[PDB]
């Protein structure tokens, strides 16, 4: 539901104090809804909504002065990366608006998937475009070619490397961490336009909070402690032969045929076929350590080597086909 607050009446007045306070209060009362929707659903569900006054104030320096904002989204699960009420929000000053969201890194999805998935956005008559940034229907995937400019995105969905296909000049910092690029940078190029990015953020995607799929880049995979949810999800996907295919390991002959695991084992019978095949053993006794081998498969699940894609808006058995 509600996600992003408003930018009320800069208005060209005075009182730096006032310009501070009318946004500080906005933040204090913006977060109220978050707490209102916090106990709203059960009393456990809670997605990663930042509460930093500093970055929430920095966001009020960039979008309006850009007046043309564009979104970056990973092409593996593009619903949660999208912001619901950002469309609703960027319609407040009565001027040039309509962020007109886009998607990014579309060089993993196949032919008979991409068109039936463009039907999603088109059926809801919304704007979008596919863009392979590393390297209405009459398109396949448009090349690099196709007044200020905003560039917002989720952490490390590729926003810090999308500009390496525009100028290719290595202007902004990038690694595989969700907290790198900070202290917004107005990158100048083609002086008729001026481009500004922002620090990364995380918005109120209430759908799928605990039993979800935000183990992509949202929480630090380099710092996790659950190691069964974040690993067992990959077990429900990626049929047994493909992990036998890449790594070459021998997992199980479906021993426990009762309601313990059955087919598609869980995150206790395959992680012990990896670490025991990698020699990663504990301190005290030879035992296949799971949680430090789950961080050697999860950095392979998200970078793009082990691939799984979203199914249509209805519950569907097997959309991907390796």
């Amino acid at each position: 539901d509600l996600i992003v607050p408003r930018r009320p009446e800069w208005n060209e007045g005075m009182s730096k104090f006032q310009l501070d306070r009318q946004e500080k209060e906005a933040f204090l009362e913006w977060r109220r809804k978050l707490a209102h929707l916090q106990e709203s659903n059960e009393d456990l569900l809670l997605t990663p909504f930042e509460r930093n006054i500093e970055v929430w104030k920095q966001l009020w320096r960039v979008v309006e002065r850009s007046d043309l904002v564009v979104q970056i989204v990973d092409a593996r699960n593009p619903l949660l990366f999208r912001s619901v009420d950002l469309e609703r929000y960027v319609k407040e000053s009565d001027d040039r608006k309509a962020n007109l969201l886009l998607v990014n890194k579309a060089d993993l999805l196949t032919k008979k998937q991409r068109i039936a998935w463009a039907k999603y956005f088109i059926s809801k008559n919304i704007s979008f475009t596919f863009y392979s940034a590393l390297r209405v229907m009459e398109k396949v995937k448009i090349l690099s070619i196709d007044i200020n400019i905003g560039l917002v995105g989720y952490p490390n969905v590729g926003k810090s490397s999308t500009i390496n296909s525009l100028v290719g000049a290595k202007k902004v910092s990038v690694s595989s961490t969700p907290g790198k690029t900070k202290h917004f940078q107005t990158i100048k190029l083609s002086d008729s336009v001026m481009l500004c990015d922002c620090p990364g953020l995380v918005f109120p995607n209430f759908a799928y909070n605990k039993g979800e799929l935000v183990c992509n880049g949202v929480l630090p995979i380099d710092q996790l402690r659950d190691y069964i949810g974040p690993a067992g999800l990959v077990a429900e996907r990626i049929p047994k032969y493909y992990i036998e295919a890449i790594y070459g390991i021998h997992i199980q002959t479906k021993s426990r045929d009762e309601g313990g695991n059955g087919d598609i084992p869980t995150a206790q019978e395959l992680l012990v076929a990896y670490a025991r095949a990698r020699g990663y053993m504990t301190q005290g006794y030879g035992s296949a350590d799971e949680p430090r081998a789950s961080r050697y498969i999860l950095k392979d699940y998200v970078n793009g080597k082990l691939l799984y894609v979203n199914p249509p808006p209805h519950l569907e058995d097997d959309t991907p086909y390796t």
Partner: protein, 136 residues
């Protein structure tokens, strides 16, 4: 000894000290038990404590059902390989050191015990004797 133990046990040759890894004999899903310390132990310099048949220990699990391990729990031995002596003079020894998981009051965690069990533990802990099929 009275951590739920019924009577007073005679002395038994201290077979398995700390650092020892003894099999588990219950259906709790644990497959071994690493002893770390002992109850009723005595304190002498450089003497690491030890556990005999019937004794209660603190143990860790090193193989099985990862909701069990990486925590300490009480355990009770039921077999040892060190030959001890019953007061009828006979000596006897099993072929494997083996124990059982329990709570601090003497109640077991599982429901049955595979393999034989010592008289000197069954007489002392009744719940063990209840879940046991073979006593020597």
């Amino acid at each position: 000894s009275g951590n739920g133990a019924q009577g007073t046990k005679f002395r038994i040759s201290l077979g398995l000290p700390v650092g020892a890894i003894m099999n588990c004999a219950d259906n709790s899903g644990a497959r071994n038990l690493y002893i770390i310390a002992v109850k009723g132990s005595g304190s002498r310099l450089n003497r690491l404590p030890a556990a005999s048949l019937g004794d209660m220990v603190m143990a860790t699990v090193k193989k099985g059902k990862p909701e069990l391990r990486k925590k300490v729990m009480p355990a009770i031995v039921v077999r040892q390989a060190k030959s001890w002596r019953r007061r009828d003079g006979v000596f006897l020894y099993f072929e494997d050191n083996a124990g059982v998981i329990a709570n601090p009051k003497g109640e077991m965690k599982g429901s049955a015990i595979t393999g034989p069990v010592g008289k000197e533990c069954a007489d002392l802990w009744p719940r063990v004797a209840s879940n046991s099929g073979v006593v020597v």
